Structure formats: C-alpha cells, structure tokens
Amino acid sequence: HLNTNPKTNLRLWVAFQMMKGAGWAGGVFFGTLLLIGFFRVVGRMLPIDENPAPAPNITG
Amino acid sequence: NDHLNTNPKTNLRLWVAFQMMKGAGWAGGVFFGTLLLIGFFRVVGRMLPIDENPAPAPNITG
Amino acid sequence: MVGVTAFGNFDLASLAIYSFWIFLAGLIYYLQTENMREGYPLENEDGTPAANQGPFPLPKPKTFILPHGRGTLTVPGPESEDRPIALARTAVSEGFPHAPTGDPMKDGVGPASWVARRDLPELDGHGHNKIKPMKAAAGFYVSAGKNPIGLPVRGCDLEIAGKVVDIWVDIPEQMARFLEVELKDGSTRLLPMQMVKVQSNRVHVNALSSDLFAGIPTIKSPTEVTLLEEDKICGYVAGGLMYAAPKR
Amino acid sequence: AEYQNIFTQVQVRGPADLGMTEDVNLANRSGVGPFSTLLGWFGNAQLGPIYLGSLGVLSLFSGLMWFFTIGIWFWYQAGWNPAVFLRDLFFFSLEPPAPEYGLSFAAPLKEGGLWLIASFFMFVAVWSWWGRTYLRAQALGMGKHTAWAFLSAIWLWMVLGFIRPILMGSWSEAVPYGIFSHLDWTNNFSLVHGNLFYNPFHGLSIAFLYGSALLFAMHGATILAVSRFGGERELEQIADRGTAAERAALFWRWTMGFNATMEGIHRWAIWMAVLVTLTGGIGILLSGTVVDNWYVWGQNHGMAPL
Amino acid sequence: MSKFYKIWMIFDPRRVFVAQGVFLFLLAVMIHLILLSTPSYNWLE
Amino acid sequence: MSKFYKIWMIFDPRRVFVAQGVFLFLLAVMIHLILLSTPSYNWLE
Amino acid sequence: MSKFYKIWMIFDPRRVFVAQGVFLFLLAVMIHLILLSTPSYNWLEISAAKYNRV
Amino acid sequence: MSKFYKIWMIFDPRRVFVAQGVFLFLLAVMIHLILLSTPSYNWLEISAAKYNRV
Amino acid sequence: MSKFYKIWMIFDPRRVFVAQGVFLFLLAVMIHLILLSTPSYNWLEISAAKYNRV
Amino acid sequence: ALLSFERKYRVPGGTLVGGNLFDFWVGPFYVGFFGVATFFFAALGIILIAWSAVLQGTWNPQLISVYPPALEYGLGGAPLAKGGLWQIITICATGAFVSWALREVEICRKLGIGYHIPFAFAFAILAYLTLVLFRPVMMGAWGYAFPYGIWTHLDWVSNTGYTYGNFHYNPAHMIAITFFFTNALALALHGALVLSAANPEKGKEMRTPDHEDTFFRDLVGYSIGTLGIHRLGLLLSLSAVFFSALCMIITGTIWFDQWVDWWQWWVKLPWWANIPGGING
Amino acid sequence: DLGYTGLTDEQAQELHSVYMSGLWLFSAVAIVAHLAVYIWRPWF
Amino acid sequence: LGYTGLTDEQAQELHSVYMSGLWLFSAVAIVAHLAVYIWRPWF
Amino acid sequence: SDLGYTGLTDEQAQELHSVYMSGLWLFSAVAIVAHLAVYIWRPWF
Amino acid sequence: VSEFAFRLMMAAVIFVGVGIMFAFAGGHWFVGLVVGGLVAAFFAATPN
Ligand code: BCL
Ligand SMILES: CC[C@H]1c2cc3[nH]c4c(c3C)C(=O)[C@H](C(=O)OC)c4c3nc(cc4[nH]c(cc(n2)[C@@H]1C)c(C(C)=O)c4C)[C@@H](C)[C@@H]3CCC(=O)OC/C=C(\C)CCC[C@H](C)CCC[C@H](C)CCCC(C)C
Ligand SMILES: COC(C)(C)C/C=C/C(C)=C/C=C/C(C)=C/C=C/C(C)=C/C=C/C=C(C)/C=C/C=C(\C)CC/C=C(\C)CCC=C(C)C
Ligand SMILES: COC(C)(C)C/C=C/C(C)=C/C=C/C(C)=C/C=C/C(C)=C/C=C/C=C(C)/C=C/C=C(\C)CC/C=C(\C)CCC=C(C)C
Ligand SMILES: COC(C)(C)C/C=C/C(C)=C/C=C/C(C)=C/C=C/C(C)=C/C=C/C=C(C)/C=C/C=C(\C)CC/C=C(\C)CCC=C(C)C
Ligand SMILES: COC(C)(C)C/C=C/C(C)=C/C=C/C(C)=C/C=C/C(C)=C/C=C/C=C(C)/C=C/C=C(\C)CC/C=C(\C)CCC=C(C)C
Ligand SMILES: COC(C)(C)C/C=C/C(C)=C/C=C/C(C)=C/C=C/C(C)=C/C=C/C=C(C)/C=C/C=C(\C)CC/C=C(\C)CCC=C(C)C
Ligand SMILES: COC(C)(C)C/C=C/C(C)=C/C=C/C(C)=C/C=C/C(C)=C/C=C\C=C(C)\C=C\C=C(/C)CC/C=C(\C)CCC=C(C)C
Ligand SMILES: CCCCCCCCCCCCO[C@@H]1O[C@H](CO)[C@@H](O[C@H]2O[C@H](CO)[C@@H](O)[C@H](O)[C@H]2O)[C@H](O)[C@H]1O
Ligand SMILES: CCCCCCCCCCCCO[C@@H]1O[C@H](CO)[C@@H](O[C@H]2O[C@H](CO)[C@@H](O)[C@H](O)[C@H]2O)[C@H](O)[C@H]1O
Ligand SMILES: [Fe+3]
C-alpha cells in the first residue's frame, strides 16, 4: 500500500521478468546436475570400480 | 507492464526485493571499493623496488 | 645504581609505578567529579530524579563571580529547563525518542533546540557590547577576503531570500560573527557565519530553505543582541539541516 | 559545499587592542606590532604588545647568551666557514664533557666547559621564564595554571640535563646541544638501557602523548562542530551555558556514555598534557639510576616472556 | 540506438524479458563449462 | 509459530529488509573468503 | 516459569529482540570459530586429510 | 531471607537485570575459558585423544 | 555494635551497595586467582595429578 | 536517566540506516544500526582475544598476544592458530572502528552539529589501516603488521624501526614528531589558559577572552584566538597522524637503507660538498 | 494489537507471506548449490 | 507492573510467539548437535 | 527514598521478586544438573 | 571551485613543472625543488 514510484517499479518489473527466465533455466540446469550427482552417488556406492569394464570403443 | 501490470502481489514482491537489493548493493559497493583500494596499493607496490630490497620479519611468527 | 628490591621483585621502579596507579585513580576521580557540575542530578524522562545517579558523587559547589555584577553562579545546584519543551514520548518505556508535538523548527526542540540563556548583551573586558554591527563598531572594515555586503542569499531550495546588509563583528576578538540579511519585507534577520558559504557572487545557506528566513527569530534591538537571541537564532538556523531537508 | 569553519572566509580589522590592566605595570608593555593577513586567515592577525618585566629581560638575556654560545661553538666547528656552517649545521654539537671528568667543572673549554657555560645560561633563562609566566598570571589576577603546566615540562628538561647527570655522577650523561646529536643521544639512551620501550613510565608518557593527540582532536572537532552555536566562546558557555555546551556534552554522552563540561574538558586537557612530561621525567630518572636493563626488568615484572 | 525503441512495438516485453534471461543465463553456463573443459582454467579441481 | 508474521507488527519491514540484504551479502562474502583461504578449497589457485 | 511472560512487563520488546539477536549470532560465530581453531574439529582440515587433497 | 524482595526498593529492576545478564554471561565465558585453557579439561582434545582423532 | 545501622544515615544506600558488591566480586576473583596461580592450590592440576590425566 | 537538559534533544531522525528499527538509547548510549554493528564487532574481537589467550596458554593480560600470519603466507589466509585469529580480529576491529565513526555521524545529524569528530576519527582509522592494510599489502605480507599484544606490538615497533637503522632520521617521522610535540604543548597551553581565566586568583571576578588574549600577548607577544586555538589543535593532531601514516608508507617501500644516509644529499651539495673542515669535511 | 509500526494484521500477513515465499525460494537455491558442491567435493 | 506500557494479554501473546520461536530454534540446534555428535562425538 | 527510589510498591516488588527467584532457581537447577553431569564425566576432586 | 582552490592546484602543477625543469637544468633535485616551492608559494599567497 506504500510501495515506491512507478519509474523504479518499471526497472523492478523488467529485472523480475529477466530473473524469472534465468531462474527457470537455472532450475532446469541444476536439476540435471543433481540427477547426474545422484547417479554418481549410487555408482560410487555400488561395487563398481572393482570391475572396470573395458573400453567399448576405440580412442577415435 | 507499466499501465496494466498483473497484481499488487507483484509490486510487493518487487518492493521487498528492491529493499534487500539496496542493502546487498551497499554492502557490495563498500566491499568492492575496499578491494579496489587494496588492489591499488598492491599494484603500486608492484612497480616499486620492493621485492628487490625485501625486509626481514618484524615480529616473530607467534 | 639502586637496584635493590624491598621484597619480591619490588624495587624503586615498582614503587614508582604503583604510586602512579594510585595517583591516576585519584586524578580520574577528581577529573570526573569536576565534570559533574552541569546537568546533574540525572532525571527520569518525566523530569523526576532517577533511581541511579552513578558511582561518582556530585562535587561541592563552586562560585564564579561574573565580571560586571552579573551575579554569582554556583555549580552544581538546582537546574530547570525554564521554557516550554513541547515533546511527547513515543514509548512508555525509557530510552526512546520523544516526538515533536507541532513544528520542531518553531518550538525549539531537537536539533533546533535553544537554551534559556540570560537576555542580556555580551560584555567584553571594557564593559561594552562584545559583538556589534559593522556600523556600530568604530573603524572596523573588511580587511581581507570577500566582502559579503549587498550579495544575494540563496536558500537550500535555490531561491533568493534576501540580500546581505551588514556584518556584526566582535570587539575584543575582531571576528566576523553574524551577517545581517534583509528579506522581501524589509526586515532584518541575523545569520551565524559558520552556516553561510560566502561565494564570489552569492552567500549560500544550505541549512535553510528560502521560505524559512522569515521564520528566523528577530532581535529586540537592531544594534545589541543578547545571548538568548543568539542562541535562538543559532538553534533555529541549525535545525534546518534536519527539518528543512525535505525541501532540498 | 558545506562550510567547515577551518579558515575564516572574511577578515575584519579595527583599533589596536592594547589589552587590559588589572595590576599590570603599563611601563614595561610594548606597542602593537603589525597585522598579519596570512596568519589572520587562521586567527587573530594582531601582533603585540609584549610585556618585558624584570624576569622577562633576565630570561631574554640568558637565552640570548645560551643560543649565541651554541652558535659561536658551531662556527668554531665550521672552521669559521659560512658554507660549512650552512652545510654541517644539523651535524654540529656542543657536547658535554667526557665521562672521565665526572661532574667536575675542571674541563677544558673545548672539551665540555663551554657546554657547562651554555647550560648555565639556558638554566637561568628557563627558570626566569617560568617566573615570568607566573608573574604575568599574577598581574592579571588569573590562576597560575600555565605556570604549573610549564613546570611539568621544566621538570622533564631538568631531569634530562641536570638532575640525572648529577645522580649518575657525570655530565657525560646529559643531552648535547645539536640537532642530530640529541636525536642520537635519544636512540643511544634507549639502546644502553635495554629497550626503553619496557620502561613503564616511557609507556605511560606515550599513553599520555597519544592521549593528548586524541583529546585535542576530539576537543577541536567538538568545538568546531558546535561553533555554529557560538561554541568558541568557551568562557561564556561556562558562565552562561548555551545550546553549544549542551550539544557538545550530549554528543559524547551518547557516544561514550560519559561527558565533560565546557570547563572540565580543559582540566582533562591540562592533565593529559602535563602527565606526558611528568611520567617521562620519572622514567628517565629511573633509567640507569635504578634500572639499567628495562627488558630484563620487564621479564621480571610480567610484561615479557621468560 | 535511438530508433531501436521501436523494437517494443513488435514484441511483447512481458515475454521477451523471460526469453532473454533464459538466453543470457544459458550463455553464462556454456562459457563457464567451456572454461572448465580446458585444463588451464578449470577452477573446480 | 503461525504468529511469526507479528514480527512485522514490531519492526518496520522497510528497514529490516535492507538490514537482511546487507547481512546476507556480508555473510556470503565471509564464507567465500573462509573457503578461499583454505588450501583444500581455494578454487582461485 | 508459567509467569515468565511478565519479563515483557519490564523490557520493551524492541530493545530485547535486537539485544538477543546480536547475542545469539555473536555466540554462534564464537563457537564456530572456536571449533575452526582447534585441529580436532576443524572440519575443513578433517575433510582435506581424509580425502588426501594435500 | 524471606524479605530480600526489598532489594527492588533500592535498584531499578531494568538496570539490575541488564547488569546481571552481562555479568552472568561474562562469568560463564570466563569459567568456560579457564576450563578450556587447561589441558586436563579441554574437552576437544580430550575427545580427540580418546578417539585417536589426532 | 548494635547501633551500626546508622551508617545508612550518612551513606547513600545505592552507591554503597554497588561499591561493596563490585569490591566483593573483585576480592573473590583476586583470591581465586592467587590460589589458582599457586600450584599447591590449583585444584585443576591437583585433580589431574590424582587421576593421572596427563 | 538523562541529564537535566537532555530531553529536548532526544528526538527521532538523523539515522543513515534504519530510522526507527534501531533508534533508541540503552542507558546513555545511542544504539543505532551502526551501534549494533560496532557492539557485535567489539564483543567478537574481545572474546576472540581471550580465546587466543587460552590458545597461547597465558592469562597474564600483558603477555597475551595475537600474532599475524608469517611472511610465508604473503597476503593470503592462515589457520586460526597460525595467523587466522589475527586476521579475523583485524576484520572485527576495522568493522568496529568504521561502525563507531558512522554511529558518530548519526549522532552528529541528530544533534544538528558539524561532522568534524567522525572525520578526525577517520584519520586515526586510516593510520591503523596504514599499519595493518596499506603497508603490508604494498609490502606483500600480512606478517609485516603488528600483533595484538600490549608489549609485543612494541616489539613490532622496535624491530621495524631498527630494520631501517635509527628511525629518527626519517623526515616524515620528524615532522610527525614535531606535530605531536607541539600538539601536546598546545593542549597544555589551551587547558591552562582557559582554566586560569575561568578560575581567578582568589575570590575575584571571572576573566574574559580579552583577558586571556592579553595574557598570551604579555607572555609571547601573540594570541591565536579562541576559534584559532581549536582550529590549531585539530590541525596539529590530524597532521601529526597524517605524517605518521606518511612516514610509515614510504618506509620499506621507497627507502630501504638506513635513513641517516638520506641527510647525505644535503652535505654533498656540489658547491660545498668537498670543502675541507667541519663535521663531514 | 501492539501497533508499534502501524501495520494491520492483514497487511502483516500479506507481507510475511511474500517474505517467506522469497525465503523458501532462496533457501532452496542454496540447498541445491550445497548439494551440487557436496557431490563435487564433500566437506564430510 | 508499571513501565513498558504493555497489557497482560499482549505480554502473554508476545511470550507465546517468542517461545514458539525459541523452541523451533532450540530444536533445530538439537538436531544439528546430534548430527554432529554422530559425525564426530565430543564425549 | 527508602520506600522505593525506583517508585515501586511493596506489592509489585513482592511479585517481581517471586518471579525472579523462580527464574534464578530454574537457572541454578540447570547449572546443578550440568555440574553433576560433568562431575560424573570427569570429576574435579 | 574557489579562486583559491584553482590557484592551489595551479601552484602545485607549476611547482612540479618548474621543479623538474630546474632539477634537470640546475644539476640537482634540490635546486629544482627550492625554485618550485618558492615560485608556487609566491603564486599561491597572492590573491586574485
Ligand atoms: C629509540 C628511541 C626510543 C625512545 C627514547 C626516548 C628517550 C631518551 C626519551 C623518550 C621520551 C618520550 N618518548 Mg620515546 N623512545 C622511543 C620510542 C617512542 C615512540 C614510538 C612510537 O616508538 C613514541 C610515541 C615515543 C614518545 C615519547 C614521548 C612520550 C616522550 C617524550 C615527551 C616529550 O614530549 O618531551 C619533549 C619536551 C621536552 C624534552 C622538554 C622541553 C621543554 C623545555 C622547557 C624546553 C625549553 C625550550 C627552550 C627554552 C627554547 C627551545 C629552543 C627554541 C624552540 C629554538 N617514544 C624509542 C624506544 N624516548 C622522553 C621521555 O621523557 O620518556 C621517558 C625521553 O627523554
Ligand atoms: C606539557 C608538556 C609540553 C609542553 C608544555 C609547555 N611548554 C611551554 C609551556 C608549557 C605549558 C609554557 O608556558 C612555555 C611558553 O611560554 O609557551 C609559549 C613553554 C615553552 N615551551 C617551549 C618550547 C618547547 N616545548 C616543548 C615541549 C612541551 N612543552 C611538551 C610537549 C618542546 C619540545 C618538544 O622540544 C619545545 C622546544 C617554548 C616555546 C616555551 C618556553 C620559552 C622559554 O623559556 O624561553 C626562554 C628563552 C630562551 C632559552 C631562548 C630564547 C631565544 C631567542 C632567540 C632570544 C632572543 C629574543 C629576541 C631578542 C627577541 C626580540 C623581540 C623584539 C624584536 C620585539
Ligand atoms: C564453415 O564456414 C565458415 C564458418 C568457415 C565460413 C562460412 C561462413 C558463412 C557461410 C557465413 C554466412 C554469413 C552470412 C550470410 C551472414 C549474414 C549476416 C547478417 C545478414 C547479419 C545481419 C545482422 C543484422 C542485424 C543485427 C540487424 C538488427 C536490426 C535491428 C535490431 C532493427 C531494429 C528493429 C526495430 C527497433 C523494430 C522495427 C520496427 C519499426 C516500426 C521500425
Ligand atoms: C577466578 O575466579 C573464578 C572465576 C574461577 C571463581 C570466582 C567465582 C565467583 C566470584 C563467582 C561469583 C558468582 C556469583 C555471585 C553468582 C551469582 C549468580 C546469580 C545471582 C545469578 C542469578 C540468575 C538469575 C536468573 C537467571 C533469573 C532469571 C529470572 C527471570 C528470567 C524471571 C523474570 C522476572 C520477572 C519478569 C519479574 C516479574 C515482574 C513483574 C512486575 C511481574
Ligand atoms: C611498606 O611499609 C609497610 C607496609 C611494610 C609498613 C608501613 C606501615 C604503615 C605506614 C602502616 C600505617 C598504618 C596506619 C596509619 C593505620 C591507621 C589505621 C586506622 C586509623 C584505622 C581506623 C579504623 C577505623 C575503623 C575500622 C572503623 C570502623 C567503623 C565502623 C565499622 C562503624 C561504621 C560507622 C558508623 C556506623 C557511623 C554511622 C553513625 C551515624 C550516626 C551516621
Ligand atoms: C564465522 O562463521 C562461520 C562462517 C565460520 C560459521 C558460522 C556460520 C553462521 C553461524 C552463519 C549464520 C547464518 C545465518 C543465521 C543465516 C541466516 C539466514 C537467513 C535467515 C536468511 C533469510 C533470507 C530470507 C530471504 C532471502 C527472503 C527473501 C524474500 C524476498 C526477496 C521477497 C521477494 C521475492 C520473492 C517473493 C520471490 C523472488 C523474486 C525476486 C524479484 C527476488
Ligand atoms: C567460550 O565459551 C563457550 C562459548 C565455549 C561456552 C560458553 C557458553 C555460554 C555462556 C552460553 C550461553 C548460552 C545462552 C545463555 C544461550 C541462550 C540462548 C537463548 C535464550 C536463545 C533464544 C532464542 C530465541 C529465539 C530464537 C526467539 C525467537 C523469537 C521470536 C521469533 C519472537 C516472536 C515474536 C514476534 C514474531 C512478534 C511478537 C509480537 C506480538 C504482538 C505477539
Ligand atoms: C649565525 O648563528 C648565530 C651565531 C648568530 C646564532 C646561531 C646559533 C645556533 C645555530 C644555535 C643552534 C642551537 C641548537 C641546534 C640547539 C639545540 C638544542 C637542543 C636540541 C637541546 C636538546 C636538549 C637540551 C637539554 C635537555 C638541555 C638541558 C639543560 C638543562 C636542564 C640545564 C643544565 C644545567 C646544568 C648542566 C648546570 C648549570 C649550572 C652551572 C653552575 C654550570
Ligand atoms: C594497582 C593499584 C593498587 C596497587 C596495589 C595496592 C598496594 C600497593 C603496593 C603493592 C605492591 C606489591 O604488589 C606485588 O608486588 C610483588 C613483588 O614481588 C609482585 O611479585 C610477584 O609477581 C612478580 C612478577 O610476576 C614475581 O616475579 C614475584 O615472584 C611475585 O612475588 C606481585 O605480583 C605484586 O602484586
Ligand atoms: C618535483 C621537483 C623536483 C624534481 C625531481 C624529479 C626527479 C629528478 C629529475 C631530474 C633527473 C635528471 O636530472 C639530471 O640528472 C643527471 C643524471 O646524470 C644529473 O646531472 C649530473 O650528471 C650529468 C650527466 O648525466 C651532468 O651533466 C651534470 O653536471 C650532473 O649534475 C642531475 O641529477 C640532473 O642534471
Ligand atoms: Fe577549548
């Protein structure tokens, strides 16, 4: 009910929209990174690395 | 965006974020000014014959 | 070398250092008590004496004899702010600001506060008015620096409020104390020189806006100014830094 | 900008003030000298009159003899060469006699006797000047505070040049009359007595010197901050307390928790200043006569690891 | 740069700001990872 | 607990938000400097 | 303890709240730094040596 | 014993409460520090020794 | 002896009470410190000797 | 409790940060935003000094010391036991001093007075930073700073002063010392003069600024005036601190040898450099 | 009630809801960064 | 009673909310302490 | 003013002292419990 | 910027310049420093 002047609110609105876009993109990227980390965690927890599978592909 | 907007909830969120941004930006400005000042003193020390005439330790390590 | 110790490692140097600790404690006690001759005893925010008065007792009274029969001032003694202080406490508990009830710049509270000093002029060692306008003084002239007479006076809102007419100077000090300023209505207000920025083409005043110079207190005489008037003028002028702020 | 009242922006000049006269003997008084605009940008531009009584003229004559004696010896060290005299002026020295003479006056003039003569001159000059300050306070009916404040520095001076050499039994201990000679005397005094930093009275003297600087920064800043309320007129604020005195008191009341008055801050000031030389004289007196190694003494009294 | 304001006669800003924020953040992440990939700047060793 | 909103009935939010902003930035700078000083975490090599 | 709310009949909440906040954060930093000073509880060095990062 | 409430006829309870709080906290800190300075009671290294966390 | 109460007719109770309280605390701390400095009365070191904690 | 004249000044306003959140007085103290900050920093610094005492193994107040990191750490971090506690306490001390200055700024605004006091305090703060920030960084090591002990910081002073011979030959040091000594002399004179005027011989009338002008003109043929003496005191103290920070900003950064050799440039002036006779001829 | 700040109950409720929404968002962002860093280089 | 200008109902509500915060804070601290003690017990 | 320099009454003082004694005893009991726990853990006698 | 302030900055810069010039020309830095200080002081003391 007190707020600020409309001119600063315009900068605030623009920055809020940009931050919402960046925030969703960051949420997607960090969800993927956390999923990769979860698979890394379960892989380290597993008896893997006592059985290193050979390279399926030539170096290339 | 300026004449229609969406809701006063957006204005309240923007105002709260603006206030916290003011605080964090004053903190950032003072911190970065300190960093600039120390960088200036260090770079002035770089171009001086110090490190060619080093001085011994003025106090024991402790 | 008398390096002999009476006991333990207590030599003459130890005697000296402990003697100085004792003397310093006594001296700090004396200095603190000599500085409790104003504003004591402490009072509650309602004006009654407070429960706590500090570990230091009040000193014995001392009497000053003012040079020109102005009377004997004994300090410490009874004290009272003999003026209508217009403030209301914002909180029931102690230690909170007292809000002004009215216009603080006019009531003389906060940064605009003034003290009910004696309503008599300031007398030099010759028994004459210490401060008098340039005309009243005989032979005094602007010896150096800018001469701020006839210059426009620009308030903090950047609008002219008047023109400088005369300077009030100090007789035994030869210091320029006050500027006399005339407004649109032809009346004169005094300005302390510590608040004016005397430029080359104007005499700026950051303390007061243009529509406040008429609110400056006036003087009963146009040649003599008393301590009460000086205090009122200075308090009003310095109060504009906080209160005349919203108008740039 | 906002004016800070560090320089007067407008100067005013009037009749020459010849001062007051409570019991002053007008005969010895001088006449007003010139007026200094440059120096008037900072304070009173008037110079003179100067009172020249009987202790005053005694002090002037003795100080003239002391300074002139040092000057003649400096010329002698120069080979009477003006170019050398202006080249080695700082490095000159009217040194005291070497320790083998002890306290004896039987020292050759070139070997410290001239130092004895100049020291007599300066002793007489300074003591007559102290009497002068006391008498000038007496004539105007004022308190003798300046006389005692001077006596503090006089005691440090007497310890450095007179009392400590007598106690040590040789004039060789005293300070030479040279620019870098007395600097070297200071550094060598510290080195001989083993880190004068661990002299407790040297530490106290430094505490009160730092305190004098702190206290005068505080007081000058305070009075300039309330000069807009006529804070400069400290005597009238004592007699008739104004808003300047109350605002100055309340600033420090709200900052530190305690405050002074317009009169008692000057009690603080004078004591903070005189304790410098009082503790310094005590510390120099104890050095050598009582303690010859201050760091070992410190070790024995806390103050330093064993 | 004067006339570039007419760009908001073409595209609705309420969506353009979101799209641009996404773009710039993803560009930042790409550059960060590219510096990570080279061995002379990988700050996460 | 569901009465924590009353903290705003005592403190003016206009100032508490600025206070929190400066506090959080200082605390973040603090922990970053603590980590950078650690040999095992000094990511700026 | 049932009548400890009377502590608010002595102290205005505004000053007590800021005093308590300063006190608590001071104590928290105090204890964290105490632990970070001793070699037994410096978690940074514990994790460095456990994972052989030196 | 049963008439010590009269102490609040002499001292303002606000002053005394603040003074006592400061004094109690400082005393507790100084006793904790006294204990933590002596190797016999420094619980951090006591635990480090009892668990071979050195 | 049985007319010692009249001391309160000549001394303000508040200042005397605070002065005697601070005096008592300072004396108590000084005596505890003198004892703690002396090895024969440092109860911490005595307890360590009894239980061979070093 | 308040002084007999305090109440008319205890009004809201003048606060830089907040405005009513931290606008109150605890006892005589004005607590602001910066009051809270300075209390926190000071309490942390004191507690950490005591903690470093127990880590050092001493409870002698005159033996407690908190040393900075060694020269090997350069301008980097350090473990708390080695030099980290000193770095944290330097952070706390800098924060406390700055918060104190800004709290003084708030008090000045609330009382409607000039800002001379916080400015003069900023001078001391910058001298402190010259000793703990500017000189170490220009030198490249936090071990060039001083420890936080009563007598060990004098050890720092002595070792630094003898790293360059007799420090008395630093000329910025000379002007700073002259300023300090004349400032002490000025303070003695000012206190004595005001006390002599306010306290007459015995049972007679108080004196006037003209009377003290008269006394000092009859003494030394001059008087600077009551505004001039306070100007002079502030200037002497601030310039003493300035040339102190100057003598320790050029030392070990511009001049590296014994400072006495500086004074050789004057005695080797070619016109009289090679004249026989005198001290150096 | 107390009204030290001139805020009605509903205004305080609305502002507090906005503040706690932002608080939870910030806390979640920090938690995600903390887990990512812990996986990359744990401190335990 | 007397100073602070508060009522018993206002004081009761204020203490109730303050105790809610107190117990929430204390519980979070307790869970943190137990986790640390599991990680590196000090007794 | 032995009837109360602080302006309290003998009724308010009674209640204040009762609540303060309650708090002091609660604090002291907590301290006793902590003292005994440490004394079991490592007695100082 | 007051007349005195402009005169002060000009005095500083002219002092630096003439000091450099007379240090190279005069055979030593002392001569240049003395000449620069003298001229700059005589310039700054005189008003406009
Ligand atoms: C390496 C050298 C030693 C050291 C060796 C000494 C020695 C030796 C002495 C001091 C003394 C002092 N030291 Mg030390 N000091 C050291 C390091 C320091 C440091 C520092 C940061 O390191 C500081 C701040 C100080 C500070 C001080 C002062 C507090 C004190 C001087 C008081 C004074 O103002 O006398 C100045 C005033 C006078 C000497 C009296 C002058 C007044 C009389 C009346 C003169 C008359 C004037 C005459 C009539 C006319 C004048 C001539 C005209 C003007 C031309 N020292 C180191 C450790 N120091 C002095 C002292 O007393 O301390 C115990 C002293 O003797
Ligand atoms: C509290 C300790 C501090 C202190 C205090 C202090 N000093 C004091 C006083 C006080 C309270 C005085 O009252 C006294 C004084 O008069 O001050 C102006 C003084 C004084 N402190 C002085 C100096 C001084 N104080 C110093 C230090 C200190 N003084 C401490 C820091 C130092 C240092 C640091 O070394 C010095 C150099 C003097 C200015 C003065 C004492 C003057 C005095 O005794 O003079 C005697 C004269 C001589 C021995 C030589 C005179 C040389 C002349 C060239 C003679 C010829 C004159 C000529 C003929 C004049 C012609 C005039 C006509 C043309 C009109
Ligand atoms: C493998 O091959 C390699 C890479 C080795 C080499 C081969 C490279 C090849 C094949 C390169 C091909 C390059 C080409 C074809 C590049 C073309 C580049 C062009 C056309 C770039 C154009 C840039 C134009 C810009 C950025 C224009 C911006 C214009 C505006 C922003 C206009 C503003 C409009 C507004 C404001 C609204 C308009 C509305 C009104 C009402 C005015
Ligand atoms: C070097 O020497 C060492 C340190 C080793 C040994 C020396 C040790 C020494 C000298 C120790 C001294 C210890 C002393 C004297 C300790 C005294 C401690 C006391 C008295 C602690 C008291 C604590 C009291 C508390 C925690 C009470 C809290 C009460 C409340 C929270 C209730 C609030 C009361 C209200 C609200 C009153 C209601 C009022 C109305 C109007 C309804
Ligand atoms: C380095 O040198 C050494 C220390 C080795 C040797 C030197 C020793 C020296 C110089 C020793 C000097 C000793 C001296 C001078 C001792 C003097 C002792 C005196 C005069 C003691 C007097 C004591 C008086 C006492 C304890 C009185 C106590 C009174 C009361 C407890 C009653 C309180 C008064 C009341 C209640 C009056 C109130 C009644 C009404 C109606 C107001
Ligand atoms: C020295 O000590 C060390 C570091 C060694 C260890 C000790 C560490 C300690 C004790 C650290 C203490 C940490 C504490 C107590 C941290 C406290 C953090 C808190 C309470 C943070 C609260 C944050 C609340 C936030 C960020 C709320 C933000 C809300 C808004 C910005 C509302 C507007 C925004 C909305 C609604 C959505 C987003 C939209 C925009 C435009 C941002
Ligand atoms: C070196 O020595 C060491 C540190 C090792 C050992 C020393 C240890 C010592 C001495 C430790 C001391 C510990 C103490 C005394 C800890 C005390 C902790 C306390 C009392 C914590 C209190 C926490 C309280 C909290 C978190 C309060 C939350 C309160 C609220 C959220 C208030 C709610 C009120 C609102 C929202 C507005 C109310 C308004 C209306 C109208 C109802
Ligand atoms: C062109 O030049 C002419 C010839 C015209 C004049 C120039 C003269 C010059 C250049 C003079 C230079 C003077 C200087 C540089 C003097 C330096 C003096 C310094 C630095 C003194 C420092 C300390 C001096 C002290 C502490 C002296 C203390 C003396 C006493 C306390 C009195 C001593 C009294 C004694 C020894 C006993 C006296 C009693 C009898 C019976 C002899
Ligand atoms: C501080 C103001 C009040 C001063 C105290 C009032 C009495 C004034 C005279 C007291 C002088 C005696 O004071 C006492 O001197 C002896 C002399 O060995 C000191 O001696 C003690 O400590 C020193 C230094 O660690 C040890 O080397 C020595 O073995 C030990 O006896 C005491 O630490 C001191 O407390
Ligand atoms: C800011 C005012 C002062 C400015 C000082 C600036 C730093 C120095 C600037 C001048 C530097 C060069 O100035 C010049 O250097 C040469 C160096 O050989 C010196 O000159 C000296 O050697 C040269 C040959 O080289 C001879 O011709 C000359 O007779 C001799 O005096 C002098 O020092 C000066 O004539
Ligand atoms: Fe003064």
Author numbering:
A (entry chain x): 10 to 69
B (entry chain X): 8 to 69
C (entry chain H): 1 to 248
D (entry chain M): 1 to 306
E (entry chain a), F (entry chain A): 1 to 45
G (entry chain D), H (entry chain F), I (entry chain I): 1 to 54
J (entry chain L): 1 to 281
K (entry chain B): 5 to 48
What does the study report here?
In addition to PufX, a previously unrecognized integral membrane protein, referred to as protein-U, was identified in the core complex. Protein-U is located opposite PufX on the LH1-ring opening and has a U-shaped conformation.
The cryo-EM structure of the dimeric LH1–RC complex from native Rba. sphaeroides IL106 was determined at 2.75 Å resolution with C1 symmetry. The two halves in the LH1–RC dimer, designated as monomer A and monomer B, are not symmetric. Monomer A is rotated approximately 8˚ anticlockwise relative to the mirror image of monomer B, as determined from the dihedral angle of cross sections in the two monomers that are perpendicular to the presumed membrane surface. While two PufX polypeptides and all LH1 and RC polypeptides were fully identified in the dimer, protein-U in monomer B was only partially detected, presumably due to its large disorder. The protein-U in monomer B could only be traced from fragmented densities for 13 amino acids near the cytoplasmic side, while other portions were highly disordered. Superposition of the RC M-subunits between the two monomers showed that the 13–14th αβ-polypeptides in monomer B have gradually shifted inward from their corresponding pairs in monomer A at the end of the LH1 rings, reaching a maximum deviation of approximately 6 Å for the last 14th αβ-pair (chain ID: 07/08). The junction of the two monomers is composed of two PufX and two pairs of LH1 αβ-polypeptides. The two PufX polypeptides function as linkers connecting the two monomers, and due to a largely tilted conformation, the two PufX polypeptides can only interact with each other through their N-terminal domains on the cytoplasmic side of the membrane.
